């Protein structure tokens, strides 16, 4: 079965010194039994990736790191953008792509995200395809249908030999910064459908290898029921990824 | 006004190539170069720590900066980079509202104005990029549009901040059109720009603000451009990636 992946998304937090400290903290608190059973990753601000790489290389940490975004292009006249080759030279493993914040604040489209998905693979990175429906879609009872299309759009023209290693993170945008909670049954339902949609686009042999993360509000209280689910293989953690003790707990969803 | 040559790498150079660049750069430059001209490189986020350690290590006179900044000070803004982050890396500058981000990332005068304030909030110096595309130039309204871009960008910025701001004019009508922007064309705008700054603040202030040319700048054209009375530097594109041609530009007098 699938090795679960716990990715801490720092968002726009931590300077390069704080990044160094926080990752040290994590390495202090985690033990061999932790890395043996669960995959641990931190997605750090661009400006922090060099500091995290030298530390990760320096103290030989088992913690993975990745970016929070990537340019669809390989290089060139794209002011402010960070390319696949740049993230690769810093030896990032992952890159969150299509995070709900970027679909909203920066008008990222399925077409744009798909391109970023492809740029990631072209460049030896593993994309974390962030998908999810807002409130209106959930009220319409079409949530899976929308999420299932988003996964397909994001995965457009992607060969199975790449897709086999992809990560999908489901963000129930209707229920994260929201008093409405998305229970594990609700997320299991989408994450099941997602694996079901992947089966159609590819093969059940592939679909069972793809880690599907939960991207709602994940805390120590939540993490157990969510994880028990048969088609949830990890979590893309928000605010709690910034708290050393709470991230370490999540990595041990085995409360 | 100390002229400012800011090398905009755009989406180029990994962290070790970046270091090699700046090493190449410092190797080719002498004290008389920095004495007359301010030298800066605007590098990808991921290169900034590497450049800082090199510049802090070898006590270089070359400055470095970012190609973007988030309007926010921190928070749930995935993928964006904040002032405090750029501030810790000891950046000097940050480009804001570059035509590429205005085109590809729907950055508005309103979004651009917010980055300018954020830049100042955290002890960075913004380089506010302004300019018109083809239609505004053919309509003969380029100056009108560019100037609206400058006023919008600088809204609610007090004189003690704006007096250190840098403006870069990008002739967007002359990238990929086959049309050339002469030094004659650019001087006119940078002139208008300084005139607008004078209204919004004072002539005394307006005379302290460096206004760059952000069009195509080569070793061949750099002298003619700089000899214009209201151009105080260049926001260099592709040639900024070329150590030799960038060193010539910094030495535009030759």
Curated annotation (Swiss-Prot), chain A:
Give, as in the UniProt entry, the pathway in which the protein acts. Carbohydrate biosynthesis; gluconeogenesis; Carbohydrate degradation; glycolysis; D-glyceraldehyde 3-phosphate from glycerone phosphate: step 1/1
Pfam families attached here?
TIM
| One example GO MF annotation | triose-phosphate isomerase activity
GO-annotated biological processes: gluconeogenesis; glyceraldehyde-3-phosphate biosynthetic process; glycerol catabolic process; glycolytic process
Q: Which reaction does it catalyse?
A: D-glyceraldehyde 3-phosphate = dihydroxyacetone phosphate
The superkingdom of the source organism is Bacteria
- Can you tell me which residues bind substrate? 9-11, 177, 217, 238-239
Subunit:
Homodimer.
Q: Which HAMAP family match?
A: TIM_B
- Protein name in the entry: Triosephosphate isomerase
**Annotated source species:** Streptomyces coelicolor (strain ATCC BAA-471 / A3(2) / M145)
């Amino acid at each position: 079965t699938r090795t679960p992946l716990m990715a801490g998304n720092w968002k726009m937090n931590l300077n390069h010194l704080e990044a160094i400290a926080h990752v040290q903290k994590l390495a202090f608190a985690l033990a061999d039994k932790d890395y043996d059973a669960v995959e641990v990753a931190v997605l750090a601000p661009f400006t922090d990736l060099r500091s995290v790489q030298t530390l990760v290389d320096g103290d030989k940490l088992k913690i993975k790191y990745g970016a929070q975004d990537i340019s669809a292009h390989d290089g060139g006249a794209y002011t402010g953008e960070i390319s696949g080759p740049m993230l690769a030279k810093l030896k990032c493993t992952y890159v969150a792509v299509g995070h709900s914040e970027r679909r909203q604040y920066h008008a990222e489209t399925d077409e744009i995200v798909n391109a970023k998905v492809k740029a990631a693979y072209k460049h030896g990175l593993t994309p974390i395809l962030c998908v999810g429906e807002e409130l209106d879609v959930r009220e319409a009872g079409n949530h899976v249908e929308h999420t299932l299309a988003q996964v397909e759009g994001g995965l457009k023209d992607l060969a199975a030999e790449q897709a086999e290693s992809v990560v999908i993170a489901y963000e129930p945008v209707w229920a994260i910064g929201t008093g409405k909670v998305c229970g594990a049954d609700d997320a299991q339902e989408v994450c099941a459908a997602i694996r079901g949609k992947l089966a159609e686009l590819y093969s059940q042999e592939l679909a069972d290898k793809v880690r599907i993360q939960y991207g709602g509000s994940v805390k120590s209280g939540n993490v157990a029921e969510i994880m028990a689910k048969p088609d949830i293989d990890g979590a893309l953690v928000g605010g709690a990824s910034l708290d050393s003790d709470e991230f370490v707990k999540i990595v041990r969803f085995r409360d």
